[PDB]
Design a protein around this nucleic acid. Structure first.
Ligand SMILES: [Mn+2]
Length: 664
RNA sequence: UUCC
């Protein structure tokens, strides 16, 4: 299957990915880096008192609150779905090495017995119907840009004025670039408009990962995370090795003189990709309108906000199945990319725009530093984009691509195993569209609520119900994958978008409730993914702008957890043992300081008005903008708060851009 | 130095 071409940083093809400015040049050369994160102002993640705190808190909570998950993966009782040892990592120090991204996932999919295209005409009609329902009758809106985000290849600018110019210039020259691409002139498109080149691979921390305590040895064991070396990555797995990264932290003592307590490990690192902003801008200009459409018209299956918002839907079901998808982004099929482009062309979308979109899902990737003495290599040839990495995280519409794939995959699962009587409803495009439009509004006996690779599938009373139970049973047995498209299983400890579905003795959706995940509160408060970046003066540009504000939304977010009170008290007690101070007081102080500092960023609130007008979501997002990247959408945040985190491009300009893209 |  052809190895992918690879070029060292020194090669002209890689050099061309970095503009002649210090930032870009430094991004190209950055070597492996690690170090303790500043968990909170003045507190490092490896501070002896903090690790002592984590040791005691994790053992105590695990021992006193064992998981309550039944044989079908439904959590009940204490609402706990696992041990609490996940907090035992030296945050800021990664597992070595991180993985090289797979240049082609075709073999990976084939070996996993996944299909290389819609397996039946019905499936082909549904995937295409999804494209028609999602990309039709879109309303333009201004292109919003995250403050402080990098434009990556080739400029690596973080300056909002520069980003706005890049975005406006891109919406203006997109057509010309796309047509150049239609002519096979990728180098031209890239050199003239910076549309193309590659994704810049950045390795991010998944701060908490599974750890178990071996009753026999009394030693802790970290979950092995398999990583691919360069050979494996460029040959799509045909050669090279797939092996377990080392999470052993002993090295930190010898290397940095850091004391490492027993049972503390290095963090799991995941690949993330920064897209070339000039190419992403014209894609984002279409993506937001699509989100606005599916979150409004198809709100039932796609717009999720609070625990109660989700609860109201699942309540009406007779059966709720919490699914789980294995490695969604790397398994995502390039044929769906081509199917989507093809259908957009049929709907009348501008060819040059579709070309831009298709190319963004075939782009080469530049690998920075997976480990010491490794990296700085471009995978793929920018002159002719042909990678099959699956779904690139920094592409302008990754969320939509995952949602489109999975939503139809789940529907097909329901049709295949429970509702054959609904197949006659899907005879052609018009009927497929009508059926999908109704299914997505929650009007059929089979339903779902989903977002990318997270979802809950439902069956009301009816003919499909009996099949629903058979499907659930098949998932429990876990011997046969219920889908030809992705590896699907049931989630151990069913949850949807952060909220655990707590069942009572009846184990039925009608008497079940969504509660926050208490473990996530712990991950967020004691294992953040980033330090506080106290050296970045503009807080709005930090990964964690106002960390202290989360204390004010805690009760609203986790109050419904059965053991909420208990955890807060175990924390207070353990923090006292470790620091000789009150954690609560410590947090109230951080809350006060950040509340005072927030007024400096929000025109709305007076030079000291409280948080009175802000919602729980507003607060969680100010403390962790990332949640606006996987949990909520712009519309869920008060407008004056959204302005703090994002800046937009003129409405007139995106409006003019959209008009030229969409169907006449 | 990404992406509702
Ligand atoms: Mn789930």
């Amino acid at each position: 299957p052809r190895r992918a071409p690879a070029f060292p940083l020194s090669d002209i093809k890689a050099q061309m990915l970095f503009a002649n400015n210090i930032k870009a040049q430094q991004a190209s050369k950055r070597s492996f880096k690690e170090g303790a994160i500043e968990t909170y102002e003045g507190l490092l993640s490896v501070d002896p008192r903090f690790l002592s705190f984590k040791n005691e808190l994790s053992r105590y909570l695990t021992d006193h609150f064992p998981a309550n998950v039944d044989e079908y993966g439904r959590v009940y009782g204490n609402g706990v779905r696992t041990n609490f040892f996940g907090m035992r990592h030296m945050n800021g120090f990664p597992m070595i090495p991180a993985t090289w991204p797979l240049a082609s996932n075709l073999k990976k999919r084939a070996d996993a017995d996944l299909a290389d295209g819609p397996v039946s005409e019905r499936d082909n009609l549904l995937f295409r119907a999804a494209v028609r329902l999602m990309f039709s009758d879109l309303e333009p809106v201004p292109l919003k840009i995250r403050k402080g985000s990098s434009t990556c290849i080739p400029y690596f600018s973080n300056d909002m004025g520069t980003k706005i110019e890049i975005a406006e210039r891109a919406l203006e020259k997109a057509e010309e670039a796309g047509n150049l691409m239609l002519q096979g002139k990728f180098d031209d498109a890239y050199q003239l408009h910076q549309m193309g080149g590659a994704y810049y691979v950045v390795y991010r921390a998944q701060s908490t990962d599974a750890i178990t305590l071996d009753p026999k040895t009394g030693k802790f064991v970290s979950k092995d995370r398999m990583v691919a070396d360069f050979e494996y990555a460029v040959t799509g797995g045909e050669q090279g090795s797939l092996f377990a990264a080392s999470k052993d932290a002993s090295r930190l003592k010898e290397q940095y003189g850091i004391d490492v307590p027993d049972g503390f490990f290095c963090e799991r690192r995941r690949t993330a990709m920064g897209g070339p902003f000039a190419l992403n801008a014209p894609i984002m200009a279409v993506a937001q309108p699509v989100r606005n459409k599916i979150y409004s018209k198809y709100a039932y299956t796609f717009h999720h906000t609070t625990r109660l918002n989700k609860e109201e839907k699942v309540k009406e079901w007779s059966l709720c199945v919490a699914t789980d998808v294995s490695d969604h982004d790397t398994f995502w099929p390039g044929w769906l990319r081509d199917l989507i482009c093809d259908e957009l062309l049929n709907m009348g979308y501008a060819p040059w725009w579709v070309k831009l979109f298709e190319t963004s899902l075939k782009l080469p990737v530049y690998v920075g530093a997976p480990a010491p003495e490794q990296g700085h290599t471009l995978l793929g040839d920018p002159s002719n984009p042909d990678l099959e990495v699956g779904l690139s995280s920094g592409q302008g519409a990754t969320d939509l691509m995952g949602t489109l794939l999975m939503s139809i995959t789940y529907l097909v699962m329901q049709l295949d195993h429970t509702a054959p009587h609904l197949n006659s409803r899907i005879k052609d495009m018009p009927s497929a569209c009508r059926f999908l439009d109704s299914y997505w509004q929650g009007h059929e006996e089979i339903r779902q609520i989903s977002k990318s690779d997270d979802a809950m599938l439902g069956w009301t009373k009816g003919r499909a119900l009996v099949g629903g139970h058979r499907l659930f049973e098949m998932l429990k047995e876990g011997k046969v994958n219920p889908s030809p498209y992705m590896k699907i299983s049931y989630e151990h400890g069913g949850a949807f978008l952060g909220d655990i579905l707590l069942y009572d003795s009846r184990r039925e959706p009608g008497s079940a409730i969504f509660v926050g995940n208490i473990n996530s509160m712990l991950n967020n408060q004691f294992s953040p993914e980033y330090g506080v970046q106290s050296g970045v003066r503009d807080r709005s540009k930090r990964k964690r702008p106002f960390p202290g504000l989360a204390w004010a939304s805690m009760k609203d977010t986790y109050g419904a957890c059965p053991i909420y009170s208990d955890v807060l008290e175990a924390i207070e007690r353990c923090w006292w043992n470790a620091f000789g101070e009150s954690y609560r007081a410590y947090r109230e102080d951080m809350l006060k300081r950040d509340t005072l500092e927030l007024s400096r960023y929000v025109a709305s609130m007076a030079r000291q008005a409280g948080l009175a007008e802000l919602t729980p979501i507003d607060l969680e997002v100010l403390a962790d903008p990332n949640k606006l990247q996987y949990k909520w959408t712009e519309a869920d945040v008060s407008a004056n708060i959204h302005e703090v985190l994002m800046h937009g491009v003129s409405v007139e300009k995106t409006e003019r851009f959209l008009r030229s893209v969409m169907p006449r």
